[PDB]
Write a protein that binds this ligand. Structure first.
Ligand code: YT3
Ligand code: YT3
Length: 582
């Protein structure tokens, strides 16, 4: 209509409109208290009601960017609080929005999240459900300025459901706390993925993202014609570029436009969009993004015919290299949803390389004949790693598998800080228990998802604390070969053992009153420091000390005087270990 505010309000819903407006303003004004934002939201809401009533009231036909900016400049203490952001309020559209976007340093140290007792929150929730979820969004929004506001709304919907059920049950802490921790982990995991996707765009460029998207969309929509997948990738690239740039308004519009188009052509894209295209406008974008892979046509031509066996390959390559390479990805990706996107890019990379030499050669059809024998090792490598690692995950527990990784990676890079080694290994153990549950046809894509974000946190951690040139090489190299680089890491033979530190290997009765997580991390920290001090001790000898130490703790914890038991007999264990490890 004449006004956009009216449409959006009516196209979305008052309560959802009031939420997005709250997040939108909270992401910029990361200082102004909660009560201030509520006033900002109400003023905007009432204004939108005026726009809903009169389709041409005072400043009602203005664009969202314009209207948003005007209200953002209305704040009194703007240059007196945020600093350079106020110079943007002296500009005009569309440069003013571009300004605001620039001055958005997403690292303003804020008071750490203060989680009270389980009953005070439940009481506050019940008294005012609406405002309890409003304060949730505010506190999160200002802490994650680049977090996609709609995605934060699905995190608030789960937050309500958790509190709605767990505040009614007998043991509220044995329902809520675990559910709250899971969300907090899911939230940081979602955040990390967005910032990784964006960092990759600002490193390898649009063409690189396009290649990633083709491979992924072809896996999800293995029926959709190539011309359709290309058009979806072209829209996804523009959507991803405006979201990484920091424009929530254009990001949310382009996502809505794409969600609408996908839902209007589902018969020509996928049959698995039936229930996603049932939902409201805002949930369409989210549902479609996590949509299950469609079944692949059984009557598919052999992909080796049009790319190797054919004698028009070089001729069909010359016409449009990227189009032809895109078709190769499309055909390979849709035939192999059990492959990681990263593996398919290794194959797509290899094929390009081989066509860039063999097509300029004397006899091409002779040169690139055996190109599919070059993929076999590229495919077998990850498959062999998964099968070998998932087998070992069955043999031991989850915690016992983490101990195996602890030893494995400490021996490889013993210079890395214990906490980084513990955090990485524990996370990597949880990948095993969340992927090995599936069969071979789901494991690799499952692994890729989790490994991508686990390997990036390590790379970010190591960049703040540079320690190994090898780890720097792995983090700075091609994103495709990131995981292979870490896999290829050899045991450090140069490394000289850390000297024995009594403080490091002294435990008390205090450990008995630690949660399973706390206890495990204390024990796993001690294991890393054992390998850093005995890096050439065998899996045999480590297992011996670990078990001797495991039996040691589960022998005085809940025993007649546990304070002396863990000090007196604890010293004997150290001495008993110091006899077998020189
Ligand atoms: Y209530
Ligand atoms: Y734009």
């Amino acid at each position: 209509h004449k006004s956009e505010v009216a449409h959006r309000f009516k196209d979305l819903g008052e309560e959802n409109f009031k939420a997005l407006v709250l997040i939108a303003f909270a992401q910029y004004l990361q200082q102004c208290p909660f009560e201030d934002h509520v006033k900002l939201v109400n003023e905007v809401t009432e204004f939108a009601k005026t726009c809903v009533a009169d389709e041409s009231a005072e400043n009602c036909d203005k664009s969202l960017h314009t209207l948003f900016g005007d209200k953002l400049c209305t704040v009194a203490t703007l240059r007196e609080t945020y600093g350079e952001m106020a110079d943007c309020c002296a500009k005009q559209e569309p440069e003013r929005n571009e300004c605001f976007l620039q001055h958005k340093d997403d690292n303003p140290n804020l008071p750490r999240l203060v989680r009270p007792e389980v009953d005070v929150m439940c009481t506050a929730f019940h008294d005012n459900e609406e405002t309890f979820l409003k304060k949730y969004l505010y506190e999160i929004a200002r802490r994650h300025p680049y977090f996609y506001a709609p995605e934060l709304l699905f995190f608030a919907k789960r937050y309500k459901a958790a509190f709605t059920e767990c505040c009614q049950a007998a043991d509220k802490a044995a329902c809520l706390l675990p559910k709250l921790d899971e969300l907090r982990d899911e939230g940081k995991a979602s955040s990390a993925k967005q910032r990784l996707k964006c960092a990759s765009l600002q490193k390898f460029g649009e063409r690189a993202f396009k290649a990633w998207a083709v491979a992924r969309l072809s896996q999800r929509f293995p029926k959709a014609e190539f011309a359709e997948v290309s058009k979806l990738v072209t829209d996804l690239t523009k959507v991803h570029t405006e979201c990484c740039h920091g424009d929530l308004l254009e990001c949310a519009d382009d996502r809505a436009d794409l969600a609408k188009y996908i839902c209007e052509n589902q018969d020509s894209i996928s049959s698995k969009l039936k229930e996603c295209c049932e939902k409201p406008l805002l949930e369409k974008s989210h549902c479609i993004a996590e949509v299950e892979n469609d079944e692949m046509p059984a009557d598919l031509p052999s992909l080796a015919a049009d790319f190797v066996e054919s004698k028009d390959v070089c001729k069909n390559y010359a016409e449009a290299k990227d189009v032809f390479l895109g078709m190769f990805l499309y055909e390979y990706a849709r035939r192999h949803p059990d492959y990681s996107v990263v593996l398919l890019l290794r194959l797509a990379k290899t094929y390009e390389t081989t066509l860039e030499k063999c097509c300029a050669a004397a006899d091409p059809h002779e040169c690139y004949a055996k190109v599919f024998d070059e993929f076999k090792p590229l495919v077998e490598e990850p498959q062999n790693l998964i099968k070998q690692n998932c087998e070992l995950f069955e043999q031991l527990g989850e915690y016992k598998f983490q101990n195996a990784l602890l030893v494995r990676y400490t021996k490889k890079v013993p210079q890395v800080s214990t906490p980084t080694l513990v955090e990485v290994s524990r996370n990597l153990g949880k990948v095993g228990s969340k992927c090995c549950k599936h069969p071979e046809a789901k494991r690799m894509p499952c692994a890729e998802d989790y490994l991508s974000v686990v390997l990036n946190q390590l790379c970010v951690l190591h960049e703040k604390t540079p320690v190994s040139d090898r780890v720097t090489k792995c983090c700075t190299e091609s994103l495709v070969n990131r995981r292979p680089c870490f896999s290829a890491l050899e045991v450090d033979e140069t490394y000289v053992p850390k000297e024995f530190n009594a403080e490091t290997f002294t435990f008390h009765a205090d450990i008995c009153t630690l949660s399973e997580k706390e206890e495990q991390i204390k024990k796993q920290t001690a294991l890393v420091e054992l390998v850093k001090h005995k890096p050439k001790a065998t899996k045999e000898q480590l297992k011996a000390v670990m078990d001797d130490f495991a039996a040691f703790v589960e022998k005085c914890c809940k025993a007649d005087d546990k304070e002396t038991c863990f000090a007196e007999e604890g010293k004997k264990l150290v001495a008993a270990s110091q006899a077998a490890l020189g």
